């Protein structure tokens, strides 16, 4: 959660930075150091996450979320069975 807040704090700095970088070009002339350089950084982000785009891949992602949820659900069941064994042997 601390890492997610650091990442959202950073992402909000990126929104503010790119807004300033564009507006510098609109106002008079700007963005020369931020041209194909930043366009490669933003692409470097996008190529990694979200990887690709089609329906096949998001369907695969949602199936994996259901399996990760199933493993998490089974881990609640194992912990509850350990609790059922715990509750029988501490009376």
């Amino acid at each position: 959660s601390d890492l997610q807040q650091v990442g959202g704090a950073s992402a909000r700095i990126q929104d503010a930075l790119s807004t300033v970088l564009q507006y510098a070009e609109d106002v008079l002339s700007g963005k020369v150091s931020a041209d194909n350089t930043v366009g490669r950084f933003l692409m470097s982000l996008v190529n990694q996450v979200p990887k690709i785009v089609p329906d096949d891949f998001e369907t695969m992602l949602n199936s994996n979320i259901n399996d990760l949820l199933m493993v998490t659900y089974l881990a609640n069941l194992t912990q509850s069975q350990i609790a059922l064994n715990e509750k029988l042997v501490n009376l």
Partner: protein
């Protein structure tokens, strides 16, 4: 098995009145003809079935056997031989013997009515004993034997005479076609084998074979007799070891009488405990038509099997044996192989079923719809490719485990929280 070690010393030394000789040089379906010969010897001469034997293929040699007994009906055998033109010059025993028998029945019949009318206990037993010799000597006179056996049966040496009388009344009235009397002595015979008698090796075996002979041929409710015979003496497909077993045929009728009167769940036990036990392993390599049904079923073939079963239908529809439920057997054989095939299948083309069995593809579609209509097949049917598609690939086993594990334990903890 205990009774099997009783067989093991003896080795097919069965006591049968015809001895060994049956109607020789027979042509069509030799396993069926061989079966008829072991059955004729073990039923002490059938008689009725001789006409059936001739109807399937022309044989002269029932005449053979048919000439040599008189107590079926003397006039019938004499007419059978004089129709053939057998020039015996040996038919002189009967007018003397029958005339002694006529005097014997009427000079018993006068006592018959006195003993009934007086009701005296010694007189009735003496009149019964004086009767018992006569009805043993000639049961042709069938209704006279039935009147005698309606009341007491038993005479001083009880076991042998009662048991032979039950077999004789059952045999006579099966031949005469009096079913109610035959149904009575099918019932009376299976009651009588409890106690038992001395049970010297061959006696118990002959009793097993007599139960097979009345149960086999099917008149009324023989699926109940199928249930009574199998769990009696504990589940065997032939009921004898010592290598020579061949009765041969009972498993064929028995399988159908499970399929058309019960769920097939249930044929998994028949496959282990009747089909793969060594008595059937002995029988299978003596009957390739029985072998094709079992061997195709246990190996799960799709298109050698269905053609060979259709080839077998052609022989089976020309079986002249009594069985009653013939197309019931054949149709549920077609269904049961299809049901077995469809258990793990992905697809079936409607046409590819139709060409194979020689039926029209609409008739094949409506037949598959009847499997679905009865819930003998989960499916979807493709309307525009004409293929039926199955899909029972059950994704997620976890929940029905979860149901049981936490229902018992959690409620058991709740039971604990009260003392």
């Amino acid at each position: 098995y205990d009774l099997t070690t009783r067989i093991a010393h003896f080795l097919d030394r069965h006591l049968v009145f015809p001895l060994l000789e049956f109607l020789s040089v027979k042509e069509i379906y030799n396993e069926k003809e061989l079966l008829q010969g072991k059955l004729d010897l073990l039923s002490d001469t059938n008689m009725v079935d001789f006409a059936m034997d001739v109807y399937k293929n022309l044989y002269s040699d029932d005449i053979p056997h048919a000439l040599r007994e008189k107590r079926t009906t003397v006039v019938a055998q004499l007419k059978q031989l004089q129709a053939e033109t057998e020039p015996i010059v040996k038919m002189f025993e009967d007018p003397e013997t029958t005339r002694q028998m006529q005097s014997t029945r009427d000079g018993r019949m006068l006592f018959d009515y006195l003993a009934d009318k007086h009701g005296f206990r010694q007189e009735y037993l003496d009149t019964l004993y004086r009767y018992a010799k006569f009805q043993y000597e000639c049961g042709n006179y069938s209704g006279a034997a039935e009147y005698l056996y309606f009341f007491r049966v038993l005479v001083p040496a009880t076991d042998r005479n009662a048991l032979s009388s039950l077999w004789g009344k059952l045999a006579s009235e099966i031949l005469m076609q009096n079913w109610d009397a035959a149904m009575e002595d099918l019932t009376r015979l299976k009651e009588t084998i409890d106690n038992n008698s001395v049970s010297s090796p061959l006696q118990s075996l002959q009793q097993r074979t007599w139960l097979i002979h009345w149960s086999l041929f099917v008149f009324f409710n023989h699926p109940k007799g199928r249930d009574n015979i199998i769990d009696l003496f504990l589940y065997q497909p032939q009921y004898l070891n010592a290598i020579q077993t061949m009765c041969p045929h009972i498993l064929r009728y028995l399988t159908t009488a499970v399929i058309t009167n019960k769920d097939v769940r249930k044929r998994r036990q028949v496959l282990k405990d009747l089909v793969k036990v060594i008595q059937q392993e002995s029988y299978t390599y003596k009957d390739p038509i029985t072998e094709f049904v079992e061997c195709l079923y246990v190996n799960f073939d799709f298109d050698g099997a269905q053609k060979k079963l259709r080839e077998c239908e052609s022989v089976l529809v020309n079986d002249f044996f009594l069985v009653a439920c013939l197309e019931d057997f054949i149709e549920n054989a077609r269904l049961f192989i299809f049901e077995t095939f469809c258990r793990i299948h992905q697809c079936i083309s409607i046409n590819m079923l139709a060409d194979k069995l020689n039926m029209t593809p609409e008739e094949a579609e409506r037949w598959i719809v009847n499997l679905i209509r009865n819930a003998r097949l989960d499916a979807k049917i493709d309307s525009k490719l004409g293929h039926v598609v199955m899909g029972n690939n059950a994704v997620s086993p976890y929940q029905q485990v979860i149901e049981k594990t936490k229902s018992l334990s959690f409620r058991s903890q709740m039971l604990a929280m009260n003392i």
